[PDB]
Amino acid sequence: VPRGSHMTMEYSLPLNSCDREQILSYFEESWWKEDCLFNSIKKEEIFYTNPDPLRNPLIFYLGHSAVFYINKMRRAGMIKESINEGYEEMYAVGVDPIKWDRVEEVWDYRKRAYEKIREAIENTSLDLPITEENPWWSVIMGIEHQRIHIETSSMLIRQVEEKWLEKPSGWEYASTRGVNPSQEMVKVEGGRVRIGRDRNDNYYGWDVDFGKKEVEVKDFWVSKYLVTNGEFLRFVEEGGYENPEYWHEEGWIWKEENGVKHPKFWGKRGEEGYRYRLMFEEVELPLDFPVEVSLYEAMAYCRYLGGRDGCNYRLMTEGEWHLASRKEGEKGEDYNLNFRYHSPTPVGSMREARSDSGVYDCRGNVWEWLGEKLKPLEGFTTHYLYEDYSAPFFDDNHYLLIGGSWASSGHSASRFYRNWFRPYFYQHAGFRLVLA
Ligand SMILES: C[N+](C)(C)[C@@H](Cc1cnc[nH]1)C(=O)O
Ligand SMILES: [Fe+3]
Ligand code: NA
């Protein structure tokens, strides 16, 4: 199925038809969005904190997106000179488990990098289509990487104390609409599903997005909504976090070692109702928003709900999501993707985010966990610009996450972007139920 079609809508650049100005605007929108995100931090020294203890300090990510562009475009030949070789080494490699520069210095690197990148986009000969061997792939890779980091850095900043932050002007949250709408299982017809793209696809992809796997999917029942905060509140209030029947050993230990008694972005003080941390402020828990959980917590809720309902629940496979999410004639405006809002939306409230099987928010709103591990597909090959993008993580310890959140833009909002995280890592991410 070609990408960019009525049922494969993409938010990224059509690489067989994008003019220079389209590339420049796509680059600028990404860079300016990242600037805006980092400018939300109103105390300079917060850049030296690592608000997510599993990731580097904010200052690293401030330099990282800029250095990545320079490194890849130099390797592709689009740029000749380095700006700062020391920076281009120190800020090049991220972490998945020094002496930092001053914030002003890193902003200064960004400004110099931005100027050099823009000039290369303005002046370099452009021959369409942009394919993997075309030097321009480094520009597209650089933009798509920055777009991923806007989202991943947003999750870091969400973990910074709100007293050091101010929401950027123009960024708006979605409002709650009230109580969670009633959950319902709906039937998705099975079929033989293709996973993976063929190369020279007219759209960007990462190495792990390309390949061929065909899976026979049986008819299945899936919850039409992502599991909501209101649904999950029943799990919390009924002792789900204290009941070992709902947890396997690995998740129980995680839960105990991290003192977890509720989802990460819920908060409670005394007997007051739960609060909920948006990007930059706390509100009363929005019962109709999708709950944002680790994979462990999603599985624990599945076990709890199966006990209550007298059945078994599990998460979708990758093939199941493609079937559940299929929507002919889909449009970019249908989904809570690409900063349509700067928060999750009430489940179902994006009324055109209903798949052809009646499943809501399969694309957008919050990532959804899958029950399957990151694996390469038949035909997997690395790209010469970035050997270690996915291969280090084929350890059967990373789970797939799919469909994008409100914060996913560009190729990260694609149906065909194959995303992954450790089961204890937090993202703007939820889940739905499958009858097992
Ligand atoms: C594919 N994810 C989103 C899991 C990756 C993408 C990525 C960014 N910089 C290097 N790789 C990650 O954030 O580690
Ligand atoms: Fe990175
Ligand atoms: Na989703």
Residue 421 Cα: closest atom of ligand 1: 4
371 three-class SS: strand
Cα angle value 81/84/87 (rounded, 5°): 135
Same domain, 209 and 83: no
**364: phi > 0 → left, psi -120 to 50 → alpha, else beta; which?**
left
Nearest in space to 129 (alpha carbons), one of 261, 23, 228: 23
Backbone φ and ψ of 145, nearest 5°: -65, -45
Number of domains in the chain: 2
148 CA distance to ligand 1 middle (Å)? 7
CA distances from 360 to 98, 174, 227 (A): 45, 17, 11
344 CA distance to ligand 1 middle (Å)? 21
Beta bridge partners of 275: 267, 284
226 CA distance to ligand 3 middle (Å)? 7
Ligand 1 atom 14: the closest Cα is on which residue?
96
Q: Name the residues around ion ligand 2, CB cutoff 5 A.
A: 94
Residue 420 Cα: closest atom of ligand 1: 4
Same domain, 396 and 297: yes
Determine whether 75 is exposed, middle or buried from the number of CB atoms within 10 Å of its CB (0-12, 13-18, 19+). middle
Measured on CA atoms in the order 323, 409, 96, 289, is the torsion positive or negative?
negative
C-alpha R_g of the chain:
21
Ligand nearest to the CA of 52: 1
Q: Show the ligand 1 pocket: residues with CB < 6 angstroms.
A: 94, 96, 145, 148, 152, 389, 419-421
Residue appearing with tokens 């995680």: 254
Backbone φ and ψ of 384, nearest 5°: -65, -20
Resolution in A: 1.6
Q: What is the CATH number of the domain that holds 57?
A: 1.20.120.450
Same domain, 117 and 205: no
Ligand nearest to the CA of 411: 1
Same domain, 331 and 192: yes
Q: Name the residues around ion ligand 3, CB cutoff 5 A.
A: 361, 368, 403
Substitution candidate for ligand 1 out of 152, 154, 370, 405 with most atoms within 8 A of CB: 152
Please tell me the distance from the alpha carbon of residue 302 to that of residue 233, in angstroms, as a whole number.
Answer: 14
Q: Could you tell me the two tokens for 24?
A: 């420049």
Nearest in space to 258 (alpha carbons), one of 275, 270, 241, 244: 241
Ligand 1 atom 9: the closest Cα is on which residue?
145
Question: Which residue type sits at 246?
Answer: Y
Same domain, 208 and 355: yes
Residue 181 lies in a domain: no
Maximal CA-CA distance, the chain: 65
407 CA distance to ligand 1 middle (Å)? 14
Residue 308 lies in a domain: yes
Same domain, 86 and 203: no
Binding-site sequence positions:
64, 145, 149
Residue 96 Cα: closest atom of ligand 1: 14
Please tell me the distance from the alpha carbon of residue 435 to that of residue 5, in angstroms, as a whole number.
Answer: 31
Which of 108, 131, 164 corresponds to the end of one domain? Answer: 164
What residue numbers bound the domain in which 80 lies? 20-97+99-164
Looking only at the bridges linking them, the beta strands covering 275-277 and 266-267 are: antiparallel
Same domain, 191 and 327: yes
Residue 327 lies in a domain: yes
Backbone φ and ψ of 56, nearest 5°: -70, 165
Residue 9 lies in a domain: no
Is 415 in contact with 368 (CB distance < 8 Å)? Answer: no
Q: Could you say which DSSP state residue 226 is in?
A: P
Cα angle value 348/350/351 (rounded, 5°): 75
Binding-site sequence positions for Fe(3+):
64, 145, 149
Around Cβ 16, how many Cβ atoms within 10 Å? 14
Same domain, 220 and 92: no
Ligand nearest to the CA of 425: 1
65 CA distance to ligand 2 middle (Å)? 7
Question: Which residue type sits at 266?
Answer: W
Residue 206 Cα: closest atom of ligand 1: 1
402 three-class SS: strand
**85: phi > 0 → left, psi -120 to 50 → alpha, else beta; which?**
alpha
Ligand nearest to the CA of 335: 3
* DSSP secondary structure, 202-213, as one string: SS---GGGBSBE
Same domain, 47 and 194: no
Same domain, 92 and 224: no
Which of 116, 133, 164 corresponds to the end of one domain? Answer: 164
Residue 319 lies in a domain: yes
Q: What is the CATH number of the domain that holds 334?
A: 3.90.1580.10
Nearest in space to 327 (alpha carbons), one of 350, 357, 351: 357
Residue 281 lies in a domain: no
Residue 398 Cα: closest atom of ligand 1: 4
Residue 42 lies in a domain: yes
Burial code of 132-169, b = ≥16 C-beta within 10 A, e = fewer?
bebbbbbbbbbbbbbbbbbbbbbbbbbbbeeebbeeee
Residue appearing with tokens 């090049």: 92
Same domain, 302 and 425: yes
322 CA distance to ligand 3 middle (Å)? 12
Beta bridge partners of 399: 373, 421
Residue 149 Cα: closest atom of ligand 1: 8
Same domain, 328 and 428: yes
Residue 262 lies in a domain: no
